[PDB]
UniProtKB/Swiss-Prot annotation, chains A, B, C, D:
Glycans are attached at residue 89. Changing residue 98 to V: In AMYLD1; amyloid polyneuropathy. Changing residue 36 to T: In AMYLD1; amyloid cardiomyopathy. The modification 4-carboxyglutamate is found at residue 33. This is Transthyretin. It comes from Homo sapiens. Belongs to the transthyretin family. Changing residue 50 to K: In AMYLD1; amyloid cardiomyopathy. Changing residue 40 to A: In AMYLD1; amyloid polyneuropathy. Each monomer has two 4-stranded beta sheets and the shape of a prolate ellipsoid. Antiparallel beta-sheet interactions link monomers into dimers. A short loop from each monomer forms the main dimer-dimer interaction. These two pairs of loops separate the opposed, convex beta-sheets of the dimers to form an internal channel. Keywords: Amyloid, Amyloidosis, Cytoplasm, Disease variant, Gamma-carboxyglutamic acid, Glycoprotein, Hormone, Neuropathy, Phosphoprotein, Secreted, Signal, Sulfation, Thyroid hormone, Transport. The chain holds residues 30 to 144 of 147 of the full protein.
Length: 115, 115, 115, 115
C-alpha cells in the first residue's frame, strides 16, 4: 500500500469519517486523468487506493472533499476542498502517507515519505 | 482591496519573500480562468490582486508556487504548489486574507474573513 | 517593540479578539517570573509587551489563555492554554512576531524573527 | 494504552525519531509532579507511558524536547520545547493521541480523543 490518506477533525479532536476524495494523475498532454477515489473509514484513513505496480512516477493530485464534510455537520467552511499536488516516485518507489488536519477556515497537509 | 495573501517560512522563521502565485476564477465550462498574479513583498505579503468591483461572487483558486520557493533555498520540497480553492463573497463582499505557512513537507492555509 | 503576538481563530476565520496572555522570563532558580501581559485587540494582535532595553537575553514563555477564549464562544477545547517557550535574542536583538492559530483540539505557533 | 504521542518532522517528511519527552501531572498543591517519560521510536511514536488505572483525572503536561531534536540535525530552532497541557478524563476514561508536527520555527499540536 504505497499511498494512504489520513484525515483529522481539529474541532472535535476525532478522525474525519466518510470524507470523500479523488486522486488524479497528470497525463502526457498535461491534463488531469482520474486515478483513484474513496472515502475515509471510522479511523479517518483511506487505504487501498493503488498498488506498487500501478503507482508509477508522475504528478498526482488528491482532492479531499472537506466542504461536504463540514456542511454535513452544519458548518459553511472556507475551502471548497483540500488539495495535495505532488511528484511521486521520482527516485524510485516510496510509500506516501498524506495527513490532512481540518478546521472550518484552515487546513494543514503533511506528507510522511518512507522507503 | 478585498484579497490579500500572506506567506510565512517555517524553516527560516521569516516572511516568504518573492513567492509567485496566480489567482483563477472558475469559468462556466468549469475550467480555471486566470485573472490575477504577483509575488510576495519583503514582508511576505501580496496586495492589490483585485478590486471590489471586479471581485464578484464565484469560485476562486490561489495557486502558490511553493516548489520554486523551496528550490531557490536549496531545500527539497514535497508539494508542487500550495491550491487554495474557495467560494467568494457568498454572503456579500468580504475582505479576505489568505495566510499560508510553509514547510518543505507540510503547509497550512488559513482564511481571515472580515466584514 | 521587540515582541508582538498575533492570534487567529480557525473555526470562525477571524482575528482571535480579547485573548489574554502572560509573558514570563525564566529566573535563576528556574521558576517562571511574570513580567508582561495583555489581551489581543480587535485585529487579534497584542503590541507593547516590552521594550528594547528591557527585553534582554533569556528564556521567555508566552502563556496564551486559549481555554477562556473557547469557553466564551461556547466551544469545548482540549488544551488548558497554548505555552510558547523560546530563548530570546541569542544572537542579539531581534524583533519577534509570535503567530498562534487556534482550533479547539489543535493549535500551531510560528515565530517570525526579523533583524 | 490511554496516552500515545506521535511526532513528525515537517522538513524531512518523516517520523521524528528518538525525541525525548516528559509528562507531568498537576498535584493538589498546584505544582507539576513527574508522571512519565520516554523517547519516540523509529515510527515517531511513544507508547506505554501510562495505564488506564494510573491515568486518573487531572491536568497533564507533556513537554517534548524538540530543541535537542533540531540541534542534533544542525539546526538552532525557535522553541525550547513543544508543550501540551490538558485536562484528562474529566468525563470518564478516554484514549488520547497527541500529534506534534515540527518545523524549526513552527510547531502544531493536535489531540485525537476517543472512547
Amino acid at each position: 500500500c504505497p499511498l494512504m490518506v489520513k484525515v483529522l477533525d481539529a474541532v472535535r479532536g476525532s478522525p474525519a469519517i466518510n470524507v470523500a476524495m479523488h486522486v488524479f494523475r497528470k497525463a502526457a498532454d498535461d491534463t488531469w486523468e482520474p486515478f483513484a477515489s474513496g472515502k475515509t473509514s471510522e479511523s479517518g484513513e483511506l487505504h487501498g487506493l493503488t498498488t506498487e505496480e500501478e503507482f508509477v512516477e508522475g504528478i498526482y493530485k488528491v482532492e479531499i472533499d472537506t466542504k461536504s464534510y463540514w456542511k454535513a455537520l452544519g458548518i459553511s467552511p472556507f475551502h471548497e476542498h483540500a488539495e495535495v499536488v505532488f511528484t511521486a516516485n521520482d527516485s524510485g518507489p516510496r510509500r506516501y502517507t498524506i495527513a490532512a488536519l481540518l478546521s472550518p477556515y484552515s487546513y494543514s497537509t503533511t506528507a510522511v515519505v518512507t522507503n
